[PDB]
Symmetry: C12
Subunit: 66 residues, 12 copies
C-alpha cells in the first residue's frame, strides 16, 4: 500500500492531498518547515499528491531532490 516520503529543503513547503473520486480538489495542505519529513500514503481519500517548494522526495520509483 504505496506511500511517498517528503523532506522539506526550505521553509513553507506544502504537501497537498487531492480527493479520490470523479471530483478532484485539494482536501488538505500540510505545511513543512526546513528538515521536516512527511511520510504519506495514498488512501481511500487521497489519490494524488502535490508538493510545492524545494523538497527531497522518495518513492518506489526512486528519488527526486529539488
Amino acid at each position: 500500500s504505496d506511500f511517498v516520503v517528503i523532506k522539506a529543503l526550505e521553509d513553507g513547503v506544502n504537501v497537498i492531498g487531492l480527493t479520490r473520486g470523479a471530483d478532484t480538489r485539494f482536501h488538505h495542505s500540510e505545511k513543512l518547515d526546513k528538515g521536516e519529513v512527511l511520510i504519506a500514503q495514498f488512501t481511500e481519500h487521497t489519490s494524488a499528491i502535490k508538493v510545492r517548494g524545494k523538497a527531497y522526495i522518495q518513492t518506489r520509483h526512486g528519488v527526486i531532490e529539488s
Copy 2:
C-alpha cells in the same frame, strides 16, 4: 495501485487525467509551475494520464525527461 511521478521543468505544465470507461474525456487538469511535483495514481476514474509541458516523469518503467 500504480502511480506516476511528474516534476515540472518549466511553468505551466498540465497533468491531465482521462476518464476510465466506454467514454474518454479530460476530467481534470492540474497546473504545475517549475519545480513542483505531482504523484498521481491511476484510479477508478483515471485510466490514462497526459503531460503537456517540459516534465521529468518517473513510472514503474523508468525515467522519461523533457
Copy 3:
C-alpha cells in the same frame, strides 16, 4: 493493471485505443504534439493500443 508510456517526437502522434470484446474498432484517439506524454492503461474497454507517428514508447517489456 499494466500500462504503456508514449512520448511524441513529432506533432500529431495518435494513441489509438481499440475496443475490448468480440468486435475490434477504435473508440478513441488521443493526439499528442511533440514532447507530450501519455501514460495509458489497458482497461475494461481498451484491449489493444496502436501508436501512429514517431514516438518513444516504454512498456513492461522495455523500450
Copy 4:
C-alpha cells in the same frame, strides 16, 4: 495479463487476432504501416496472434526482429 508489442518494419504488416474457444478463425486484422506500433493483449476473445510481414516483436520471452 500478457501482451505483445509489435512494430512494423515495412508497409502493410498484418497483426491478426484468432478466436478463443473450440473454434479458431481470424476475427480481426490490424494493418500496420512502417514504424507503427501495436501493443496488444491476449483477452477473453483472442488466444492467438499472427504477424505477417517484416516486424520487430517484443514479448515476455524477449525479442524477435524480422
Copy 5:
C-alpha cells in the same frame, strides 16, 4: 496464462493445437510461411502445441531453433 512464440524459418510450417481433456485430437492447424510469427496461448481448449517445419520457438523455458 502461458504462451509460445513461433517464427517460421521456411514456408509451410504447421502449428497444431491438441484438444484439452480425456481425448486428444488435432483441433486446428495454422500454416505459417517463412518470416511469419504466431504467439499462441495454452487455453481451455489447447493443452499441447505441435510444430512441424523449420521454426524458431521461444517459451518460458528458453529458445529452441530449427
Copy 6:
C-alpha cells in the same frame, strides 16, 4: 500450469501421456519425426509424461 518442451532428434519419437488418478495407463502417444516440437502441459488428465526416442527436452528445471 507447468509444461514440457520436446524436440525430436530422430524419427518416431513418442511423447506419452500417462493418466491422472488412482490408475496409471497411457491415454495418448504423440509421435514426432526428426525436428518436430511438442510443447505439452500437465493437465486434469495427464499427470506424467514419458518420452521414448532421442529428444532434446526442456522443463522448468533445465535441459
Copy 7:
C-alpha cells in the same frame, strides 16, 4: 503492513500521526528524546506521519 523507523538525534523530536479519512488532523504526537527509537506502522487510524526535529529515518524506500 508497512512501517517507519525513527531515531531522535536531539531532544523533543515529535512523531505525529495524522488521521486516516476525509478529515486530516493529528490525533497523536509521540515525543522522543535524543537516542530514542520509534518503530511505527501505518494503521486503520494513521495514514500519514510527520517527523519534526532532527532524526534518522528508515522506510521501505531507504534512509
Copy 8:
C-alpha cells in the same frame, strides 16, 4: 505443482509411485529403458516416488546423477 524429471542411464530402471494417505504401498511401477525420460508430478494419488537403477534425476532442489 511439483514434478521430478528422471532419465534412465541403463536398461530396466523403475520409477515407482507410492500412495498418498494413511497407507503407503506401490501403486504403479514405470519401466524405463536407457535414455528414456519420465517427467512425473506429485499428485492427489502419489506422494512419494522411488527410483531403482542408474538414473539422472532432476528436481527443484537440483540434480542427482547415478
Copy 9:
C-alpha cells in the same frame, strides 16, 4: 506479520508497546538488562514500538545501533 529485534547495550532499556486504534497509550513496558534480547511482533494490540536506552535494533529495513 512483522517484528523488531531489540538487544540491550546497557541495563534498564525499555521496550514500550503503543496501543493500536483511535487512542494511543503505553500498554506495556519491558525492561531489558544489558545483553538481553526481545523480538516483538506488531500485533492487533501494538502498532508502534518505542525503545528508550542504548539498543541494537534490527528490522526489515536494516540495523539501527546505540
Copy 10:
C-alpha cells in the same frame, strides 16, 4: 507442498515417516538399497521424516551428505 530427496549411499537405508497430529508414531519405513533414490512429500499424514543409514539428502535448505 515441500519434499525431500534421499539417495542411499549403502544398502539398508530406512526412510521413516512420522504421523501428523497430536500423536507421533512411525507409520511406514521404506528400505533403500545403495544407489536408490526416494523423493517424498510432507503430507496430511507425514509431518516429519527420519533417515537412518548413509544417505545423500537434498531439501529446500541445501545438501546434507553421509
Copy 11:
C-alpha cells in the same frame, strides 16, 4: 509464518514467551543449557520472545551473537 532460532552459548539461558492480546505476561520459560538450540515460532499465543543470557540468535533479519 515467522520463527526464531536460539542457541545457548552458556548454561541456564532462558527463552521466555510473552502472551498475545491486550495483556502481556510471561506464559512460559524454556531453559537452555550450553549448545542446546530452540527453534520457536510466533503463534496465536506468543507475540513476543525474550532471551536472557549469552545466546546466538538467528532470525529473518540476520544474526545477533552475544
Copy 12:
C-alpha cells in the same frame, strides 16, 4: 509450511516438539543416533522445537 533439518553428530540426540497452544509442554521426543537425519515441520501441534545434543541444524535462516 516451514521445516527444520537435524543431523545427529553423537548418539542420543533428542529432537523435542513443544505443544502449540496456551500450554507449553513437550508431547514428543525423537531420538537420533550419530549420523541419523530428521526433517521436521512445524505443525498444528508443534510450535517450537528444541534440539539437545550435538547436531548440525539447517533452517530457512541458514545453518
